């Protein structure tokens, strides 16, 4: 049940990895993976009904 993932290596001395094993039945007991996703800001930065083309006049 071991999970093997790669570290993003910052200062250096191939891919360096690290190992994780969950010891408990409840996912709440688990540490945070920090393997998170990003998304585009659009729902907050461009919430307009008609798609904005930045080279175009915003008002037409």
């Amino acid at each position: 049940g071991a999970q093997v993932s790669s570290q993003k290596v910052g200062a250096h001395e191939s891919t360096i990895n690290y190992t994780t094993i969950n010891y408990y039945r409840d996912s709440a007991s688990n540490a945070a993976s920090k393997q998170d996703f990003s998304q585009d800001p659009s729902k907050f930065t461009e919430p307009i009904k008609d798609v904005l083309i930045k080279t175009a006049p915003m008002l037409n």
Partner: peptide, 5 residues
């Protein structure tokens, strides 16, 4: 056994 991400 092992998962590899």
């Amino acid at each position: 056994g092992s998962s590899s991400t």
